[PDB]
């Protein structure tokens, strides 16, 4: 089923690590997990075919940033490719550069894309070269992102938008797709705007373009060159497995190859509406400080229209 | 999680539904989800749904109502993965009942052992193994002649622990250092790493495969030659065996990666090695025919085992065609001045390199090695310091430092060998229970001549049989008996004969004269009859005739190699018999192992079927189980780990069965272990009618049922006394008997839970 | 028996402080100070065998008192070192019952007897008698299991760090006591 | 009840009675190096030593040996019990 | 799981070597003094308790900043190496 | 002192090394079979019980003529060296 990618090492932890692993097994790809010492018990370690300790001796977070140890493990284990997930090293130039150099497929865009979009300014720049709106401080805006996919063969699709406006102290809390309270016309101006930018730089794999909206204008603010936490809600309204798509793209296929099954832009539609809620140990009765300890009872839920993507809640 | 499914309603646990933009997509997600599910406690129908979903007629989209009842591939299921459950069954069993033959005690808290830090993807030097591959046996020999330094064979992975730790060192602990060994010790002539008592001890006591050890290691150390110790006549086995068995064993040993065969006879009878030697030549490998040292050539009183003796035999062995001449001082009897003279003379006499092997029993090992080195010896056997001394080999680093300022040096890297040594320093603690050799010089061996190993061993039996008080008597008798036999070379198996008879003569108040007088009325141990029968070769100088006559009792001693006289084994027949017993196709290796150790081979199979490949466990777990609240990591294969934790240990029911409460990779698991060694009364759950409980205060006369018995309503479960007047507790329904909380005898009160009857 | 403590390594000229001339000067001052027997106290078992031959030889050429050698079998070369010393003329050596010999103790009295009994120069000992005594210690040692904590096998590292027989086991204890058991190698390097 | 300080508290083992050398009753201790000292003092012993071709032995079993291996814990009771035998069986030692 | 204090109390746990939140005895000896209570905040290096080793007092410290959890020993208690003494949550 | 049989039973004694009426285990293992009852008469050398040592059966005999007294073990029981097994009165 896969051309070059026979084994993927998932260089992350938690929820997104499990998501990737699940997409890999669906495509018959072998998985390799990494865990910090501190994460010796994280359940994502039990979801992969192989697991290896990383960052021995480093601090909890630094251990998942140990590029060279990750490369050692990638190579040791026979990993054709690395999925960096979100956060951690997913947006880190040295890490992409460093994979490319080792002939290890980086399941993401090219290093130069992380470069032009690692900076808050050189992004502004690229948005100007694209000929799309930007800010020159905005009143009561909606915060609205557009999902982009793009293959190595110059095809580039969008998967409509997500409304990420519900925030607490500027951190996302509930995400809704699509943005129910805007017009079809505005939706396209924004969506086409993000395609324009992402084609303009020949963007590769999954990425997201963020916009602020006031009434009927919108203004570019950011590109995240990675999967996002809320991609879930987009898969739900469009039908398109984003994480499999990522893998397919990086292997070398093209969006519409019948196996990858991504429709033509005209044939991509919105079906229904979806909401995401992130369940965390942040205690609202204690200033949202994360609780700790053993989870003695954990019982999730089910039924029609329900999706669960488990982090370290088992 | 924690539900009790009952037999009354449908069985349904959960409806799993998956979706795609296409059927094809949905099928992949169903596949993943069925596999990713974990359900334990009860069997499920998942193996079957997978078969359906994977079938290409399912994927095609074209199936009809008679798809299943006519696709019989759907009902062939794979061999279950229950490696976890097995591992838990092993651990729970040693934790509750202890490991056999050692005192049962809390598992200690151990240091993690110091592993040498090797740069990642570093570069193993070629060594002596490459020379063999390119230029064969003669190439290695020529090479050896060129070297001014003395060369080192390392015995740490075989004779060293055979001597100090009852050969109990496990493959896991050996693999873990092998990589480093390759990188850090590339200049060794060889690694003695197989043969001796390791073959049977691996199977019999470690529940692991010696062939796997040899083969895993071969890859791990590709630069240095592997050496083994072979008893000529009987290989590594316990008998005599027909020639084709010996040749097959050797052939496989050679394929599997053994490069140098040290071949000896326990009586120095050259005929007894002739098959083996020839087989080694034919495999393209190195032959190290060996002469066993005994007596004391510095003492002319003693006229049997003299320097001319060793010289004659050195020549015959070159004539018989050995690449390297080995001198095997099994008991550490070769004093230093005699080493100088012996090695000197033998160098004047034969044109092959010489390989010396002593034991540091007396404290003079190194000194003896320094003498040997001054006289030209080509190769000597040493061990890591932490596994050296006493009845082991002298220290490899000890030797390096003792010679580094002499006329003649060793090629070793002290620092490297010290770093390796640390690993063994640590790991040795795991084997405390087998570290029983009193580890200090014993110069008495110059009187009695008991080999390194058999001293600790023979003492054990003496103690076992109530003679621990009289060990000195037995050591004196051991000496007497060697004289009674006309003075023989004592090493396995000649040594056993001398120990068997020594024990017997002490046990039965028998002197030497007592045996000459009343010998025709006395029944001597089987090994002694066998010895005089000729069943382990012919002693130099031959049997003493009067004593032979008394022991055999008219029996007619053969005068040839017992392998000449034996029906060759039929490998095709034996392989089929075994296949039957194992229930699948055995390897050429399984077969030879079954031939050599039929019983213990099958006991090994029985064991790994019950508990899986327990080889993989860390040694402290292997011998001691788990502490409450401990977590271990069990490496099944690189990258594939069982994180196992032990939470608690259930109270026993009547037959001793406890439930052991584990978490395995996040999954709570409950396994039943019968406590064999048991030194609060449960009441019923009034709600549950599967509970059968006592009605009044009294006792249990008789329990009439066993766990798993089928019952029909009204049937007799047990009988309870109430002031001596018997009354009979019956089944309240049809069902199956479960746990039984009481025994004939037990006193009981009303409410007391007695028996459980599942529907 | 005024004694000179052996340290360093006189077979190594890199090392210029504790040399054979050093031991010779001090041997004389000590005879001057008025010692009946000159003792050489190799507390750490550092005196290799060839250096023993040379050292004892030289010191015999230099002073007219008998010489008493004392080493520790820490490295595994104790006996060998004693045999060298014996070849060069040493008058007296310190040994112990086999069952209390080896490792950080003295070499075995019976070990020595048997190793020399066929050389140019012998010891005056009765093997059999010393073996019978030895049995007593073989047995009694078990009483002290709880204090028998020296890892009893050669440690050639003492040639790097130079920790005496006793203080190795001891210093390790404190290292362990104070939470540094994991880092004992660091401490030996620091020593 | 409370254990001995500084060691793990554990059941007392069942020990062998140790092998004491059999000495004839009222046997006869050889003079040795101690007599030389008493008669001829330090110089006498020194001169004696110079005469000996064999190498002489000081036995460290009762001091440095157990200082090294057993934390110097060997007790006088265990030492007295072998001393008689020592005198009879090891008379040729230079010193103890 | 609920925590109930047993008012009327009439086997020694060893450490989980893996976990550094476990503070365990280094050598055989006893507990002179426990210097902390459950829930106390500590800074790396601070004094948790004091353990005797043949009468010569030595002081067990916090291996990091954190919060004190369960305490398995009391002033008096006799201890062996490996014995779990105190737990310090991060 | 009166002897009462406890019908309802829900620490291992070692031997008194001094006393030869005590018969104790030689090595670590278990009890296969007890061949005698209390009050049985024995002649020196007779079979008292059989003890396993790594599966290889070995037989504990009477060290003299006498009478069997108390029996501290049963078929099944696990045993260590020094463990008092049977008592044989003269
Ligand atoms: N030239 C020679 N003659 C006799 N024996 C010698 C010898 N060279 C060495 N040896 C023997 O070897 C032992 C150690 O010598 P080194 O120097 O290694 O002690 C001596 C002696 O027993
Ligand atoms: N003539 C000599 N020249 C140099 N070293 C000697 C020697 N005689 C003995 N040695 C030293 O003493 C050691 C043992 O000799 P043996 O014979 O007891 O090894 C030798 C060497 O290191
Ligand atoms: Mn050997
Ligand atoms: Mn000293």
Coordinates of N, CA and C in Angstrom, one line a residue, chain B residues 99-105 168 205 434 460 463-466 677 679 745-747, chain F residues 7-10 12 14 26-29 52-54 58 60 76-78 80-81:
Chain B
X99 N 11.8 -20.2 44.1 CA 12.5 -20.9 43.0 C 13.0 -22.2 43.6
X100 N 13.0 -23.3 42.8 CA 13.3 -24.6 43.5 C 14.8 -24.7 43.8
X101 N 15.1 -25.2 45.0 CA 16.5 -25.5 45.4 C 17.3 -24.3 46.0
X102 N 16.6 -23.2 46.1 CA 17.1 -22.1 46.9 C 16.1 -21.6 48.0
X103 N 16.7 -21.1 49.0 CA 15.9 -20.5 50.1 C 15.1 -19.4 49.6
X104 N 13.8 -19.5 49.9 CA 12.8 -18.5 49.4 C 12.9 -17.2 50.3
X105 N 13.3 -16.1 49.7 CA 13.5 -14.8 50.4 C 13.1 -13.6 49.7
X168 N 25.4 -21.0 36.6 CA 24.1 -20.5 36.5 C 23.9 -19.2 35.7
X205 N 18.4 -26.2 34.2 CA 18.1 -25.3 35.3 C 17.8 -23.8 34.8
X434 N 24.0 -18.9 44.4 CA 24.8 -20.0 43.8 C 26.3 -19.8 44.0
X460 N 28.7 -30.8 48.6 CA 27.3 -30.7 48.6 C 26.7 -32.0 48.9
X463 N 27.3 -33.3 52.4 CA 26.4 -32.6 53.4 C 25.0 -33.1 53.2
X464 N 24.5 -33.2 52.0 CA 23.2 -33.7 51.7 C 22.9 -35.1 52.3
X465 N 23.8 -36.0 52.3 CA 23.7 -37.4 52.7 C 24.1 -37.5 54.2
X466 N 24.2 -36.4 55.0 CA 24.4 -36.4 56.4 C 25.9 -36.6 56.8
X677 N 2.4 -23.9 50.1 CA 3.0 -23.9 51.4 C 2.3 -23.0 52.3
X679 N 0.6 -21.7 55.8 CA 1.0 -21.9 57.2 C -0.1 -21.9 58.2
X745 N -12.9 -31.2 57.9 CA -12.3 -30.8 59.1 C -12.8 -29.4 59.6
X746 N -12.5 -28.4 58.8 CA -12.9 -27.1 59.0 C -14.2 -26.9 59.9
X747 N -14.1 -26.0 60.8 CA -15.2 -25.6 61.7 C -16.0 -24.4 61.0
Chain F
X7 N -7.8 -29.2 66.4 CA -8.5 -29.6 65.2 C -8.6 -28.6 64.0
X8 N -8.3 -27.3 64.3 CA -8.7 -26.2 63.5 C -7.6 -25.3 63.2
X9 N -6.5 -25.7 62.6 CA -5.3 -24.9 62.4 C -5.3 -24.1 61.0
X10 N -5.2 -22.7 61.1 CA -5.5 -21.8 59.9 C -4.3 -21.4 59.1
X12 N 9.2 -21.8 61.6 CA 10.0 -23.1 61.5 C 10.9 -23.2 62.7
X14 N 14.3 -24.7 64.4 CA 15.6 -25.3 64.0 C 15.9 -26.3 65.0
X26 N 19.1 -31.5 56.1 CA 20.5 -31.4 55.7 C 20.6 -30.3 54.7
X27 N 19.7 -30.3 53.7 CA 19.7 -29.2 52.7 C 18.3 -28.7 52.5
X28 N 18.3 -27.6 51.8 CA 17.1 -26.9 51.4 C 16.3 -27.7 50.3
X29 N 15.0 -27.8 50.4 CA 14.2 -28.7 49.6 C 12.8 -28.9 50.1
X52 N 13.1 -34.2 49.2 CA 13.5 -33.8 47.8 C 14.6 -32.7 47.9
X53 N 15.6 -32.8 47.0 CA 16.6 -31.8 46.8 C 16.8 -31.5 45.3
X54 N 16.0 -30.6 44.7 CA 16.0 -30.3 43.3 C 15.3 -31.4 42.5
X58 N 15.9 -38.3 48.4 CA 16.9 -38.8 49.3 C 16.2 -39.1 50.6
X60 N 15.9 -39.9 54.7 CA 16.4 -39.6 56.1 C 16.2 -40.8 56.9
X76 N 4.5 -32.5 51.8 CA 4.3 -31.2 51.1 C 5.2 -30.1 51.6
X77 N 5.2 -29.9 52.9 CA 6.1 -28.9 53.5 C 7.4 -28.6 52.9
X78 N 7.8 -27.4 52.8 CA 9.1 -26.9 52.3 C 10.1 -26.8 53.4
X80 N 14.4 -26.2 55.0 CA 15.8 -25.6 54.9 C 16.7 -26.3 55.8
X81 N 18.0 -26.1 55.6 CA 19.0 -26.9 56.4 C 19.0 -26.3 57.9

